[PDB]
Amino acid sequence: DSDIVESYARAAGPVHLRVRDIMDPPPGCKVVVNAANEGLLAGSGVCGAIFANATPALAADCRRLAPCPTGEAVATPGHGCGYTHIIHAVAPRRPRDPAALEEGEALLERAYRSIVALAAARRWACVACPLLGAGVYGWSAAESLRAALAATRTEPAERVSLHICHPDRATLTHASVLVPLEHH
């Protein structure tokens, strides 16, 4: 646990900020979150990496399940990507000029809430998660962390610990400063 930048106490469960690749499962996490699109298609970034390490059966399962509305999540087996299961969660694209922005912050928080509720219902206690929306969808690492740390205040039926993974140390330490700074 030397990769942990910070650990936050939240109603859902501890949120750990971890310097590691999403494809390098944290100890105890058998379940990973895909930063997915509404069509559940392979993309770049995290979604690319998960699909890169899986069988075609994953695309087949997504064909059966698509679309996943923005703000929602849906599960599939992991099909050899290194995790037993994948939680495909769809973050909104960041609105370019409000008032869609406040609407989009709520939808980003909702995506995280959807992950937690889904994991709780499957009794998955630990989930490895990227910073939803912090790639091509345009959100910053701090916006995505703030959203996760807001979403996890909603108490779930069963505790779920989010291990948030990003391979770049500076991105995470920077984010860990901006979150409290907003409130300062």
Short mmCIF file of N, CA and C in Angstrom, two decimals:
data_model
loop_
_atom_site.label_atom_id
_atom_site.label_comp_id
_atom_site.label_asym_id
_atom_site.label_seq_id
_atom_site.Cartn_x
_atom_site.Cartn_y
_atom_site.Cartn_z
N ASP A 1 0.83 -1.20 0.00
CA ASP A 1 0.00 0.00 0.00
C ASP A 1 0.87 1.26 0.00
N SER A 2 2.08 1.15 -0.56
CA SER A 2 2.95 2.31 -0.72
C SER A 2 2.51 3.21 -1.87
N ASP A 3 1.58 2.75 -2.71
CA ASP A 3 1.09 3.53 -3.83
C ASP A 3 -0.07 4.43 -3.46
N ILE A 4 -0.48 4.45 -2.20
CA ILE A 4 -1.70 5.15 -1.81
C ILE A 4 -1.35 6.59 -1.46
N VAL A 5 -1.92 7.52 -2.22
CA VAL A 5 -1.68 8.94 -1.96
C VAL A 5 -2.50 9.41 -0.78
N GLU A 6 -3.74 8.96 -0.68
CA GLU A 6 -4.63 9.34 0.41
C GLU A 6 -5.76 8.32 0.48
N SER A 7 -6.34 8.19 1.67
CA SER A 7 -7.47 7.30 1.92
C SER A 7 -8.56 8.10 2.63
N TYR A 8 -9.73 8.17 2.02
CA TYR A 8 -10.83 8.99 2.51
C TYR A 8 -11.90 8.11 3.15
N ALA A 9 -12.42 8.55 4.29
CA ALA A 9 -13.49 7.83 4.97
C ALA A 9 -14.83 8.34 4.45
N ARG A 10 -15.63 7.44 3.88
CA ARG A 10 -16.91 7.79 3.29
C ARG A 10 -17.94 6.74 3.70
N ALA A 11 -19.21 7.10 3.57
CA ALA A 11 -20.28 6.19 3.96
C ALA A 11 -20.22 4.88 3.18
N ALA A 12 -19.95 4.96 1.87
CA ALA A 12 -19.93 3.75 1.06
C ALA A 12 -18.81 2.82 1.50
N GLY A 13 -17.68 3.39 1.89
CA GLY A 13 -16.50 2.63 2.21
C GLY A 13 -15.28 3.48 1.94
N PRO A 14 -14.12 3.05 2.42
CA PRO A 14 -12.91 3.85 2.20
C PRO A 14 -12.65 4.03 0.71
N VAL A 15 -12.22 5.23 0.35
CA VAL A 15 -11.79 5.54 -1.01
C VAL A 15 -10.28 5.73 -0.96
N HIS A 16 -9.56 4.87 -1.66
CA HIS A 16 -8.11 4.93 -1.72
C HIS A 16 -7.69 5.51 -3.06
N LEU A 17 -6.78 6.48 -3.03
CA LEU A 17 -6.18 7.07 -4.22
C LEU A 17 -4.84 6.39 -4.44
N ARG A 18 -4.73 5.61 -5.52
CA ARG A 18 -3.61 4.70 -5.71
C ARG A 18 -2.85 5.00 -6.99
N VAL A 19 -1.53 5.06 -6.88
CA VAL A 19 -0.66 5.27 -8.04
C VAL A 19 -0.39 3.89 -8.64
N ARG A 20 -1.21 3.51 -9.62
CA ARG A 20 -0.99 2.25 -10.31
C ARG A 20 -1.88 2.20 -11.54
N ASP A 21 -1.50 1.33 -12.46
CA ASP A 21 -2.33 1.05 -13.63
C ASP A 21 -3.63 0.37 -13.21
N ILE A 22 -4.71 0.72 -13.91
CA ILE A 22 -6.00 0.09 -13.66
C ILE A 22 -5.94 -1.40 -13.96
N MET A 23 -5.05 -1.81 -14.87
CA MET A 23 -4.91 -3.22 -15.23
C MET A 23 -4.01 -4.00 -14.27
N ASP A 24 -3.49 -3.35 -13.23
CA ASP A 24 -2.68 -3.98 -12.19
C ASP A 24 -3.53 -4.13 -10.94
N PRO A 25 -4.31 -5.20 -10.81
CA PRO A 25 -5.35 -5.25 -9.77
C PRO A 25 -4.79 -4.96 -8.39
N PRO A 26 -5.39 -4.03 -7.65
CA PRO A 26 -5.01 -3.85 -6.26
C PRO A 26 -5.32 -5.11 -5.46
N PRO A 27 -4.51 -5.41 -4.45
CA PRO A 27 -4.77 -6.62 -3.65
C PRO A 27 -6.21 -6.64 -3.14
N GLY A 28 -6.92 -7.72 -3.43
CA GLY A 28 -8.28 -7.88 -2.97
C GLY A 28 -9.35 -7.43 -3.93
N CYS A 29 -9.00 -6.67 -4.96
CA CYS A 29 -9.98 -6.22 -5.95
C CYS A 29 -10.04 -7.24 -7.08
N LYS A 30 -11.16 -7.94 -7.18
CA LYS A 30 -11.39 -8.87 -8.27
C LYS A 30 -12.29 -8.24 -9.33
N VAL A 31 -12.73 -7.01 -9.11
CA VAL A 31 -13.73 -6.34 -9.94
C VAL A 31 -13.17 -4.99 -10.35
N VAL A 32 -13.30 -4.66 -11.63
CA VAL A 32 -12.76 -3.42 -12.17
C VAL A 32 -13.89 -2.64 -12.83
N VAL A 33 -13.72 -1.33 -12.87
CA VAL A 33 -14.65 -0.43 -13.53
C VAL A 33 -14.07 -0.02 -14.87
N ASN A 34 -14.89 -0.14 -15.91
CA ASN A 34 -14.57 0.38 -17.23
C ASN A 34 -15.19 1.76 -17.38
N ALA A 35 -14.38 2.73 -17.79
CA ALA A 35 -14.87 4.06 -18.15
C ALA A 35 -15.47 3.94 -19.54
N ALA A 36 -16.75 3.59 -19.59
CA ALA A 36 -17.39 3.14 -20.81
C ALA A 36 -18.22 4.25 -21.46
N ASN A 37 -18.60 4.00 -22.70
CA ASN A 37 -19.51 4.85 -23.45
C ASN A 37 -20.88 4.18 -23.54
N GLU A 38 -21.88 4.97 -23.94
CA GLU A 38 -23.26 4.50 -23.91
C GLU A 38 -23.46 3.25 -24.76
N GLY A 39 -22.70 3.12 -25.85
CA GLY A 39 -22.77 1.95 -26.69
C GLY A 39 -21.94 0.77 -26.23
N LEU A 40 -21.17 0.94 -25.16
CA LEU A 40 -20.37 -0.13 -24.58
C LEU A 40 -19.34 -0.67 -25.57
N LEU A 41 -18.84 0.20 -26.43
CA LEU A 41 -17.85 -0.15 -27.44
C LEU A 41 -16.44 0.10 -26.91
N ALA A 42 -15.48 -0.63 -27.47
CA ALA A 42 -14.08 -0.41 -27.12
C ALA A 42 -13.64 0.97 -27.59
N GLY A 43 -12.96 1.70 -26.71
CA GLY A 43 -12.44 3.00 -27.05
C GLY A 43 -10.95 3.07 -26.83
N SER A 44 -10.46 4.25 -26.47
CA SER A 44 -9.07 4.42 -26.09
C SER A 44 -8.97 4.44 -24.56
N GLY A 45 -7.80 4.81 -24.06
CA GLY A 45 -7.64 4.98 -22.62
C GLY A 45 -7.95 3.70 -21.87
N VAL A 46 -8.65 3.86 -20.74
CA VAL A 46 -8.93 2.73 -19.86
C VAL A 46 -9.76 1.69 -20.59
N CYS A 47 -10.81 2.13 -21.29
CA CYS A 47 -11.65 1.21 -22.02
C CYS A 47 -10.84 0.41 -23.03
N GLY A 48 -9.92 1.07 -23.73
CA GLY A 48 -9.03 0.35 -24.62
C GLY A 48 -8.25 -0.73 -23.90
N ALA A 49 -7.67 -0.40 -22.75
CA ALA A 49 -6.84 -1.36 -22.03
C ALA A 49 -7.65 -2.58 -21.61
N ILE A 50 -8.87 -2.38 -21.10
CA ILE A 50 -9.67 -3.51 -20.65
C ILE A 50 -10.02 -4.42 -21.82
N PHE A 51 -10.51 -3.83 -22.91
CA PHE A 51 -10.84 -4.62 -24.09
C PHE A 51 -9.60 -5.26 -24.69
N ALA A 52 -8.46 -4.56 -24.62
CA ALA A 52 -7.23 -5.11 -25.17
C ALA A 52 -6.86 -6.44 -24.52
N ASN A 53 -7.29 -6.65 -23.28
CA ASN A 53 -6.89 -7.82 -22.51
C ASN A 53 -8.03 -8.83 -22.36
N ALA A 54 -9.07 -8.72 -23.17
CA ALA A 54 -10.24 -9.57 -23.03
C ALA A 54 -10.54 -10.30 -24.33
N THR A 55 -11.38 -11.32 -24.21
CA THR A 55 -11.84 -12.06 -25.34
C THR A 55 -12.93 -11.29 -26.05
N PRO A 56 -13.15 -11.73 -27.31
CA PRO A 56 -14.37 -11.21 -28.02
C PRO A 56 -15.69 -11.34 -27.28
N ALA A 57 -15.79 -12.32 -26.38
CA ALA A 57 -17.04 -12.50 -25.66
C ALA A 57 -17.44 -11.25 -24.88
N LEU A 58 -16.49 -10.38 -24.56
CA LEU A 58 -16.83 -9.15 -23.86
C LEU A 58 -17.61 -8.21 -24.77
N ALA A 59 -17.15 -8.04 -26.01
CA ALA A 59 -17.91 -7.24 -26.96
C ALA A 59 -19.28 -7.86 -27.22
N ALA A 60 -19.35 -9.19 -27.24
CA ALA A 60 -20.63 -9.86 -27.42
C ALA A 60 -21.58 -9.57 -26.26
N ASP A 61 -21.07 -9.66 -25.03
CA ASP A 61 -21.91 -9.34 -23.87
C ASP A 61 -22.37 -7.89 -23.92
N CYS A 62 -21.49 -6.98 -24.35
CA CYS A 62 -21.90 -5.58 -24.46
C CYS A 62 -22.93 -5.38 -25.56
N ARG A 63 -22.79 -6.06 -26.70
CA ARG A 63 -23.82 -5.96 -27.74
C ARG A 63 -25.19 -6.29 -27.17
N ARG A 64 -25.25 -7.29 -26.29
CA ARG A 64 -26.52 -7.70 -25.71
C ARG A 64 -27.05 -6.67 -24.72
N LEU A 65 -26.16 -5.89 -24.12
CA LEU A 65 -26.54 -5.01 -23.02
C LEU A 65 -26.68 -3.55 -23.44
N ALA A 66 -26.06 -3.15 -24.55
CA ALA A 66 -26.08 -1.76 -24.93
C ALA A 66 -27.50 -1.32 -25.28
N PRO A 67 -27.83 -0.04 -25.08
CA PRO A 67 -26.99 1.00 -24.50
C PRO A 67 -27.00 1.02 -22.97
N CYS A 68 -25.93 1.55 -22.37
CA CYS A 68 -25.91 1.90 -20.96
C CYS A 68 -26.06 3.40 -20.84
N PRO A 69 -27.20 3.91 -20.37
CA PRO A 69 -27.39 5.37 -20.32
C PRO A 69 -26.30 6.04 -19.50
N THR A 70 -25.96 7.27 -19.90
CA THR A 70 -25.06 8.10 -19.13
C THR A 70 -25.54 8.18 -17.69
N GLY A 71 -24.61 8.02 -16.75
CA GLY A 71 -24.92 8.03 -15.35
C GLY A 71 -25.22 6.67 -14.76
N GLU A 72 -25.42 5.66 -15.60
CA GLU A 72 -25.71 4.30 -15.16
C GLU A 72 -24.48 3.41 -15.30
N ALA A 73 -24.62 2.18 -14.81
CA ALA A 73 -23.58 1.18 -14.90
C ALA A 73 -24.21 -0.18 -15.14
N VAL A 74 -23.45 -1.08 -15.77
CA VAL A 74 -23.88 -2.45 -16.01
C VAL A 74 -22.66 -3.35 -15.96
N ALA A 75 -22.86 -4.57 -15.47
CA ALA A 75 -21.78 -5.51 -15.23
C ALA A 75 -21.71 -6.57 -16.32
N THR A 76 -20.50 -7.06 -16.57
CA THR A 76 -20.26 -8.23 -17.40
C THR A 76 -19.15 -9.03 -16.75
N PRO A 77 -19.02 -10.31 -17.09
CA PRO A 77 -17.79 -11.04 -16.74
C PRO A 77 -16.58 -10.30 -17.29
N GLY A 78 -15.41 -10.67 -16.78
CA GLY A 78 -14.18 -10.00 -17.14
C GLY A 78 -13.47 -10.57 -18.35
N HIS A 79 -13.80 -11.81 -18.69
CA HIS A 79 -13.29 -12.48 -19.90
C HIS A 79 -11.78 -12.34 -20.03
N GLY A 80 -11.08 -12.67 -18.96
CA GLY A 80 -9.63 -12.77 -19.00
C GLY A 80 -8.87 -11.47 -18.96
N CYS A 81 -9.51 -10.36 -18.63
CA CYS A 81 -8.80 -9.09 -18.57
C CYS A 81 -8.00 -8.92 -17.28
N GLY A 82 -7.99 -9.91 -16.40
CA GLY A 82 -7.32 -9.81 -15.12
C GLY A 82 -8.25 -9.62 -13.94
N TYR A 83 -9.54 -9.41 -14.19
CA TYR A 83 -10.56 -9.29 -13.17
C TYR A 83 -11.67 -10.27 -13.46
N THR A 84 -12.37 -10.71 -12.41
CA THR A 84 -13.49 -11.62 -12.63
C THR A 84 -14.65 -10.92 -13.32
N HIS A 85 -14.86 -9.64 -13.04
CA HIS A 85 -15.99 -8.90 -13.59
C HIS A 85 -15.58 -7.47 -13.92
N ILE A 86 -16.33 -6.88 -14.85
CA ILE A 86 -16.16 -5.48 -15.24
C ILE A 86 -17.47 -4.75 -14.99
N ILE A 87 -17.39 -3.61 -14.33
CA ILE A 87 -18.51 -2.69 -14.17
C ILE A 87 -18.34 -1.59 -15.20
N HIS A 88 -19.15 -1.62 -16.26
CA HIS A 88 -19.12 -0.58 -17.27
C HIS A 88 -19.96 0.59 -16.79
N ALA A 89 -19.32 1.72 -16.49
CA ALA A 89 -20.00 2.91 -16.00
C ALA A 89 -19.77 4.05 -16.98
N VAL A 90 -20.84 4.77 -17.31
CA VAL A 90 -20.83 5.78 -18.35
C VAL A 90 -20.86 7.15 -17.69
N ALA A 91 -19.73 7.85 -17.75
CA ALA A 91 -19.62 9.24 -17.34
C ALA A 91 -20.14 10.17 -18.43
N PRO A 92 -20.69 11.32 -18.06
CA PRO A 92 -21.03 12.32 -19.08
C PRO A 92 -19.77 12.97 -19.62
N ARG A 93 -19.85 13.40 -20.87
CA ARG A 93 -18.88 14.37 -21.37
C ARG A 93 -19.04 15.67 -20.59
N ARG A 94 -17.93 16.35 -20.34
CA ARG A 94 -18.00 17.59 -19.57
C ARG A 94 -18.66 18.70 -20.40
N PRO A 95 -19.76 19.29 -19.94
CA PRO A 95 -20.39 20.37 -20.72
C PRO A 95 -19.45 21.56 -20.88
N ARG A 96 -19.42 22.12 -22.09
CA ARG A 96 -18.40 23.12 -22.41
C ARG A 96 -18.71 24.50 -21.84
N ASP A 97 -19.98 24.85 -21.66
CA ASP A 97 -20.35 26.12 -21.05
C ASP A 97 -21.68 25.94 -20.34
N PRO A 98 -21.77 26.19 -19.02
CA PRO A 98 -23.01 25.88 -18.28
C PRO A 98 -24.23 26.54 -18.91
N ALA A 99 -25.43 26.27 -18.41
CA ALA A 99 -25.72 25.54 -17.19
C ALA A 99 -25.67 24.02 -17.34
N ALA A 100 -25.38 23.51 -18.52
CA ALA A 100 -25.24 22.06 -18.62
C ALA A 100 -24.19 21.54 -17.65
N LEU A 101 -23.25 22.39 -17.21
CA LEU A 101 -22.15 21.93 -16.36
C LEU A 101 -22.63 21.38 -15.02
N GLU A 102 -23.38 22.17 -14.25
CA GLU A 102 -23.97 21.63 -13.03
C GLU A 102 -24.80 20.38 -13.30
N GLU A 103 -25.54 20.35 -14.40
CA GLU A 103 -26.23 19.11 -14.75
C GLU A 103 -25.23 17.97 -14.96
N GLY A 104 -24.07 18.28 -15.55
CA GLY A 104 -23.09 17.25 -15.84
C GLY A 104 -22.30 16.80 -14.63
N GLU A 105 -22.12 17.69 -13.65
CA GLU A 105 -21.51 17.26 -12.40
C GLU A 105 -22.39 16.24 -11.69
N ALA A 106 -23.70 16.48 -11.68
CA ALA A 106 -24.62 15.53 -11.05
C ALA A 106 -24.56 14.18 -11.75
N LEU A 107 -24.44 14.18 -13.08
CA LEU A 107 -24.40 12.92 -13.82
C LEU A 107 -23.09 12.18 -13.60
N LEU A 108 -22.00 12.92 -13.40
CA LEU A 108 -20.73 12.29 -13.06
C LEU A 108 -20.78 11.66 -11.68
N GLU A 109 -21.34 12.38 -10.70
CA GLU A 109 -21.55 11.79 -9.38
C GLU A 109 -22.46 10.57 -9.48
N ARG A 110 -23.51 10.65 -10.30
CA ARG A 110 -24.44 9.54 -10.44
C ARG A 110 -23.74 8.29 -10.96
N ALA A 111 -22.85 8.44 -11.95
CA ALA A 111 -22.12 7.28 -12.45
C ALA A 111 -21.39 6.57 -11.32
N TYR A 112 -20.74 7.33 -10.44
CA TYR A 112 -20.07 6.73 -9.30
C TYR A 112 -21.05 6.08 -8.34
N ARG A 113 -22.19 6.74 -8.07
CA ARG A 113 -23.21 6.14 -7.21
C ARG A 113 -23.70 4.83 -7.81
N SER A 114 -23.85 4.80 -9.14
CA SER A 114 -24.32 3.59 -9.81
C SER A 114 -23.32 2.45 -9.66
N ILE A 115 -22.03 2.75 -9.73
CA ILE A 115 -21.01 1.73 -9.47
C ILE A 115 -21.21 1.14 -8.08
N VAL A 116 -21.34 2.01 -7.08
CA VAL A 116 -21.39 1.54 -5.70
C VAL A 116 -22.61 0.66 -5.49
N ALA A 117 -23.78 1.15 -5.89
CA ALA A 117 -25.01 0.38 -5.72
C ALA A 117 -24.92 -0.96 -6.43
N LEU A 118 -24.35 -0.98 -7.64
CA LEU A 118 -24.21 -2.24 -8.36
C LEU A 118 -23.31 -3.20 -7.59
N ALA A 119 -22.13 -2.74 -7.18
CA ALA A 119 -21.23 -3.59 -6.42
C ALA A 119 -21.88 -4.09 -5.14
N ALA A 120 -22.58 -3.20 -4.43
CA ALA A 120 -23.25 -3.62 -3.20
C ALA A 120 -24.22 -4.76 -3.48
N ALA A 121 -24.99 -4.64 -4.56
CA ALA A 121 -25.98 -5.65 -4.89
C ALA A 121 -25.34 -6.98 -5.24
N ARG A 122 -24.13 -6.97 -5.79
CA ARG A 122 -23.41 -8.21 -6.05
C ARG A 122 -22.56 -8.64 -4.86
N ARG A 123 -22.55 -7.85 -3.79
CA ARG A 123 -21.72 -8.10 -2.61
C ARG A 123 -20.24 -8.16 -2.99
N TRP A 124 -19.83 -7.26 -3.88
CA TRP A 124 -18.42 -7.04 -4.15
C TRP A 124 -17.93 -5.98 -3.17
N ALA A 125 -16.93 -6.33 -2.37
CA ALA A 125 -16.47 -5.45 -1.30
C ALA A 125 -15.43 -4.45 -1.75
N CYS A 126 -14.68 -4.74 -2.82
CA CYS A 126 -13.62 -3.87 -3.31
C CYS A 126 -13.70 -3.79 -4.82
N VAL A 127 -13.50 -2.59 -5.36
CA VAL A 127 -13.60 -2.34 -6.79
C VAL A 127 -12.45 -1.42 -7.19
N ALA A 128 -11.72 -1.80 -8.23
CA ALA A 128 -10.70 -0.95 -8.83
C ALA A 128 -11.35 -0.05 -9.87
N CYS A 129 -11.08 1.25 -9.78
CA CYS A 129 -11.83 2.24 -10.52
C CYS A 129 -10.89 3.29 -11.10
N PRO A 130 -11.09 3.69 -12.35
CA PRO A 130 -10.35 4.84 -12.89
C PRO A 130 -11.06 6.13 -12.51
N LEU A 131 -10.43 7.25 -12.85
CA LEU A 131 -11.07 8.55 -12.69
C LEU A 131 -12.03 8.71 -13.85
N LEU A 132 -13.29 8.34 -13.61
CA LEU A 132 -14.32 8.44 -14.64
C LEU A 132 -14.33 9.82 -15.28
N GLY A 133 -14.36 9.83 -16.61
CA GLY A 133 -14.49 11.05 -17.36
C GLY A 133 -13.22 11.86 -17.51
N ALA A 134 -12.12 11.44 -16.90
CA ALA A 134 -10.90 12.22 -16.88
C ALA A 134 -9.98 11.92 -18.05
N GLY A 135 -10.47 11.21 -19.06
CA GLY A 135 -9.74 11.11 -20.31
C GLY A 135 -10.36 11.96 -21.39
N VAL A 136 -10.78 11.33 -22.49
CA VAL A 136 -11.31 12.09 -23.61
C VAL A 136 -12.63 12.78 -23.28
N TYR A 137 -13.33 12.37 -22.22
CA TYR A 137 -14.61 12.98 -21.89
C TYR A 137 -14.45 14.35 -21.22
N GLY A 138 -13.22 14.75 -20.88
CA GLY A 138 -12.91 16.15 -20.67
C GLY A 138 -12.82 16.62 -19.23
N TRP A 139 -13.19 15.79 -18.26
CA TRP A 139 -13.09 16.20 -16.87
C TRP A 139 -11.65 16.11 -16.39
N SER A 140 -11.31 16.96 -15.42
CA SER A 140 -10.01 16.89 -14.79
C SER A 140 -9.99 15.80 -13.72
N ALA A 141 -8.79 15.41 -13.31
CA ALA A 141 -8.66 14.43 -12.24
C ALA A 141 -9.33 14.92 -10.96
N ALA A 142 -9.21 16.22 -10.66
CA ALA A 142 -9.79 16.73 -9.43
C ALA A 142 -11.31 16.77 -9.51
N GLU A 143 -11.87 17.10 -10.67
CA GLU A 143 -13.32 17.06 -10.83
C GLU A 143 -13.85 15.65 -10.65
N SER A 144 -13.12 14.66 -11.17
CA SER A 144 -13.56 13.28 -11.08
C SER A 144 -13.42 12.75 -9.65
N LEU A 145 -12.33 13.13 -8.97
CA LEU A 145 -12.16 12.72 -7.58
C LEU A 145 -13.23 13.36 -6.70
N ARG A 146 -13.45 14.67 -6.87
CA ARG A 146 -14.50 15.34 -6.12
C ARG A 146 -15.83 14.63 -6.31
N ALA A 147 -16.14 14.23 -7.55
CA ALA A 147 -17.39 13.53 -7.80
C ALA A 147 -17.44 12.20 -7.05
N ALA A 148 -16.36 11.43 -7.11
CA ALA A 148 -16.34 10.14 -6.41
C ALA A 148 -16.50 10.34 -4.91
N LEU A 149 -15.84 11.36 -4.36
CA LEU A 149 -15.89 11.62 -2.93
C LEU A 149 -17.21 12.23 -2.50
N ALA A 150 -18.00 12.74 -3.45
CA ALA A 150 -19.38 13.12 -3.18
C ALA A 150 -20.32 11.92 -3.31
N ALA A 151 -20.14 11.13 -4.37
CA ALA A 151 -21.02 9.98 -4.61
C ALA A 151 -20.96 8.99 -3.45
N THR A 152 -19.79 8.81 -2.85
CA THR A 152 -19.64 7.80 -1.81
C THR A 152 -20.22 8.22 -0.48
N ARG A 153 -20.74 9.44 -0.37
CA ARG A 153 -21.42 9.87 0.85
C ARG A 153 -22.81 9.25 0.96
N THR A 154 -23.38 8.81 -0.16
CA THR A 154 -24.65 8.10 -0.14
C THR A 154 -24.43 6.70 0.41
N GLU A 155 -25.09 6.39 1.53
CA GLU A 155 -24.88 5.12 2.19
C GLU A 155 -25.49 3.99 1.37
N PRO A 156 -24.72 2.97 1.01
CA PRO A 156 -25.27 1.86 0.24
C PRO A 156 -25.79 0.74 1.12
N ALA A 157 -26.40 -0.28 0.51
CA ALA A 157 -26.91 -1.41 1.28
C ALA A 157 -25.78 -2.23 1.88
N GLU A 158 -24.63 -2.29 1.21
CA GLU A 158 -23.45 -2.98 1.69
C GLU A 158 -22.23 -2.12 1.37
N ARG A 159 -21.21 -2.21 2.22
CA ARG A 159 -20.03 -1.37 2.04
C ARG A 159 -19.28 -1.76 0.77
N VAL A 160 -18.77 -0.74 0.08
CA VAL A 160 -18.00 -0.91 -1.14
C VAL A 160 -16.82 0.05 -1.05
N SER A 161 -15.61 -0.48 -1.15
CA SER A 161 -14.39 0.32 -1.13
C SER A 161 -13.93 0.56 -2.56
N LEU A 162 -13.80 1.83 -2.94
CA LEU A 162 -13.28 2.19 -4.25
C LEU A 162 -11.78 2.41 -4.18
N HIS A 163 -11.03 1.60 -4.93
CA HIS A 163 -9.60 1.81 -5.12
C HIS A 163 -9.44 2.56 -6.44
N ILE A 164 -9.25 3.87 -6.36
CA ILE A 164 -9.13 4.69 -7.56
C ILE A 164 -7.69 4.66 -8.03
N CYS A 165 -7.49 4.25 -9.28
CA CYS A 165 -6.16 3.97 -9.81
C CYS A 165 -5.84 4.91 -10.96
N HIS A 166 -4.65 5.49 -10.91
CA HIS A 166 -4.16 6.29 -12.00
C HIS A 166 -2.65 6.11 -11.94
N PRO A 167 -1.99 5.83 -13.06
CA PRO A 167 -0.56 5.48 -13.01
C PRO A 167 0.37 6.65 -12.75
N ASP A 168 -0.09 7.90 -12.85
CA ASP A 168 0.78 9.06 -12.71
C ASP A 168 0.66 9.66 -11.31
N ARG A 169 1.77 9.65 -10.57
CA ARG A 169 1.77 10.16 -9.20
C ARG A 169 1.36 11.62 -9.14
N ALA A 170 1.96 12.46 -10.00
CA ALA A 170 1.71 13.89 -9.94
C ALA A 170 0.23 14.21 -10.16
N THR A 171 -0.41 13.51 -11.09
CA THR A 171 -1.83 13.75 -11.33
C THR A 171 -2.63 13.55 -10.05
N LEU A 172 -2.31 12.50 -9.29
CA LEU A 172 -3.09 12.18 -8.10
C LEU A 172 -2.76 13.10 -6.93
N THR A 173 -1.48 13.39 -6.71
CA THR A 173 -1.13 14.31 -5.63
C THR A 173 -1.71 15.69 -5.91
N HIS A 174 -1.60 16.14 -7.16
CA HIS A 174 -2.22 17.39 -7.56
C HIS A 174 -3.71 17.38 -7.26
N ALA A 175 -4.41 16.33 -7.69
CA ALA A 175 -5.84 16.23 -7.43
C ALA A 175 -6.15 16.25 -5.94
N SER A 176 -5.31 15.59 -5.13
CA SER A 176 -5.58 15.52 -3.71
C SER A 176 -5.45 16.87 -3.03
N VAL A 177 -4.75 17.82 -3.66
CA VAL A 177 -4.66 19.17 -3.13
C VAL A 177 -5.84 20.02 -3.58
N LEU A 178 -6.26 19.86 -4.84
CA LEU A 178 -7.32 20.70 -5.38
C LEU A 178 -8.67 20.43 -4.73
N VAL A 179 -8.93 19.19 -4.31
CA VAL A 179 -10.21 18.83 -3.72
C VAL A 179 -10.43 19.65 -2.46
N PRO A 180 -9.54 19.57 -1.45
CA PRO A 180 -9.72 20.43 -0.27
C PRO A 180 -9.62 21.91 -0.60
N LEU A 181 -8.84 22.27 -1.62
CA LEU A 181 -8.66 23.68 -1.96
C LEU A 181 -9.97 24.32 -2.39
N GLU A 182 -10.78 23.60 -3.17
CA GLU A 182 -12.09 24.12 -3.57
C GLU A 182 -12.88 24.59 -2.35
N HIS A 183 -12.83 23.83 -1.26
CA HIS A 183 -13.57 24.17 -0.05
C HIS A 183 -12.86 25.21 0.81
N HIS A 184 -11.58 25.46 0.57
CA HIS A 184 -10.83 26.50 1.28
C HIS A 184 -11.08 27.88 0.70
#
